[PDB]
Amino acid sequence: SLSNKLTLDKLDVKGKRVVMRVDFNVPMKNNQITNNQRIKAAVPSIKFCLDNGAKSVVLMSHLGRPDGVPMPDKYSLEPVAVELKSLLGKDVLFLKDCVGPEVEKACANPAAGSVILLENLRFHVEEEGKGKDASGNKVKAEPAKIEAFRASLSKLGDVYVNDAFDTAHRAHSSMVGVNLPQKAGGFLMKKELNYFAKALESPERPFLAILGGAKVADKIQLINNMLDKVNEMIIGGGMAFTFLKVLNNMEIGTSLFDEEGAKIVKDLMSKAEKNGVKITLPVDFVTADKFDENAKTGQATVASGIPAGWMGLDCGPESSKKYAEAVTRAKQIVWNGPVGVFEWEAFARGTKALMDEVVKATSRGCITIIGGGDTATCCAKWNTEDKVSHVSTGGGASLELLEGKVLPGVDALSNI
Ligand SMILES: Nc1ncnc2c1ncn2[C@@H]1O[C@H](COP(=O)(O)OP(=O)(O)O)[C@@H](O)[C@H]1O
Ligand SMILES: [Mg+2]
Ligand SMILES: [Mg+2]
Numbered sequence: 001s002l003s004n005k006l007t008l009d010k011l012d013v014k015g016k017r018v019v020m021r022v023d024f025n026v027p028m029k030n031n032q033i034t035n036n037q038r039i040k041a042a043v044p045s046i047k048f049c050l051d052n053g054a055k056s057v058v059l060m061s062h063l064g065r066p067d068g069v070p071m072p073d074k075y076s077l078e079p080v081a082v083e084l085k086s087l088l089g090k091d092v093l094f095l096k097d098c099v100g101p102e103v104e105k106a107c108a109n110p111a112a113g114s115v116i117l118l119e120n121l122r123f124h125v126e127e128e129g130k131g132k133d134a135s136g137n138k139v140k141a142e143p144a145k146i147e148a149f150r151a152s153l154s155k156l157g158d159v160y161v162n163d164a165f166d167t168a169h170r171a172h173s174s175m176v177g178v179n180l181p182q183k184a185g186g187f188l189m190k191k192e193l194n195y196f197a198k199a200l201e202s203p204e205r206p207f208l209a210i211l212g213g214a215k216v217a218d219k220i221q222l223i224n225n226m227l228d229k230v231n232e233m234i235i236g237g238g239m240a241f242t243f244l245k246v247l248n249n250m251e252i253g254t255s256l257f258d259e260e261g262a263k264i265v266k267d268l269m270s271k272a273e274k275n276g277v278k279i280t281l282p283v284d285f286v287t288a289d290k291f292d293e294n295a296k297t298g299q300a301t302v303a304s305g306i307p308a309g310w311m312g313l314d315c316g317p318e319s320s321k322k323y324a325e326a327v328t329r330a331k332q333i334v335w336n337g338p339v340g341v342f343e344w345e346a347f348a349r350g351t352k353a354l355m356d357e358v359v360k361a362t363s364r365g366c367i368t369i370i371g372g373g374d375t376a377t378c379c380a381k382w383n384t385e386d387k388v389s390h391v392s393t394g395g396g397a398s399l400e401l402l403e404g405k406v407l408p409g410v411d412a413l414s415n416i
Contacts, residue, residue, distance in 0.1 A: 019156045024038055057115050162184070176408050207230045210236065
């Protein structure tokens with residue numbers, strides 16, 4: 001299935017106008033781009049089109065949270081057009097809208113090899129289908145205007161490419177509303193489809209899931225679905241304290257505890273036993289007197305408990321050994337969620353040590369897949385993006401795939 005979607009390498013673009021949805025939602029500090037990695041990531045798809053004789057590449061994206069009102073002073077894509085030109089080595093024409101007669105005329109039959117970047121899709125309520133007015137009240141798009149917006153986008157190319165996996169979980173106009181005969185995943189999308197097909201359809205084995213992060217209750221369906229796919233699961237991060245309080249009566253102090261998640265811990269452990277999944281929980285911890293980067297630190301074990309007032313913010317050295325044992329056994333790994341508060345150096349050792357192990361595993365042929373969002377931020381922070389098999393470009397989207405969902409943007413792509 002994820003396997004059988006049309007991708008850009010299989011799409012004839014010679015003489016065609018290409019309308020391409022890209023992820024240019026770059027971090028900003030008052031209109032200046034603080035990280036251009038997303039822009040670089042789209043260059044292979046763009047260059048492929050140009051190298052294979054595309055008449056034009058029209059780029060559409062969003063930036064920030066305009067909520068369906070034009071906010072060009074705060075969330076304009078104009079700075080991205082400057083940065084893209086530098087990265088591509090080609091002129092980029094920036095348009096101050098993304099739909100309407102002037103845009104359509106500009107994109108109808110441009111000079112061959114033209115690269116065009118449109119203004120922020122989310123200045124229009126029709127993109128998301130909803131937004132907020134100037135009073136901050138919810139507005140709903142009108143069907144006739146959604147149809148018009150979609151029809152306008154559809155005029156801007158002869159074929160469609162979606163290289164914006166980070167939005168593919170949303171049934172937005174630019175994801176599902178472009179009415180062209182061929183709709184292909186770009187090269188970023190292709191890597192997401194391929195690697196998550198390994199995670200979901202045909203894993204190498206033993207297959208290990210490393211599930212960390214903060215909250216349990218938002219990860220129930222993720223854990224549940226992964227328990228149908230994996231042979232081993234590490235449960236780490238803040239989630240672990242709910243499991244340990246329930247199963248061991250551990251004293252956890254002020255560590256994160258999920259009162260709803262607590263009521264399904266035994267249900268998940270039961271499913272793991274039923275499917276033969278080996279669960280690895282942490283056994284030791286770095287503690288902190290408060291949730292702060294420069295908190296006083298201590299140590300604890302499951303047996304010692306955590307003192308009243310104190311929280312467990314990372315795993316300890318014996319946990320790291322047990323985690324490394326599981327990684328050593330694995331031929332495929334999916335990792336969603338850091339195993340400690342990686343943002344702060346005092347509480348990053350567990351996540352860094354585990355990253356080191358996943359990198360070593362990759363070196364001897366382990367297929368290693370990092371989910372988007374905070375686990376991906378870890379790879380960027382320690383320069384390991386090139387040393388694991390795959391770092392997903394979409395946090396929410398990777399999580400929804402791993403839950404077992406059909407992503408509307410993926411489903412909209414042409415088959416075969
Ligand atoms: N022991 C812990 N206590 C509190 N927060 C934690 C702990 N371990 C990890 N975290 C936090 O988990 C967050 C990431 O979790 P999550 O958002 O679920 O990850 P992802 O974006 O990878 O899905 C980070 O902000 C990190 O600081
Ligand atoms: Mg249409
Ligand atoms: Mg993540």
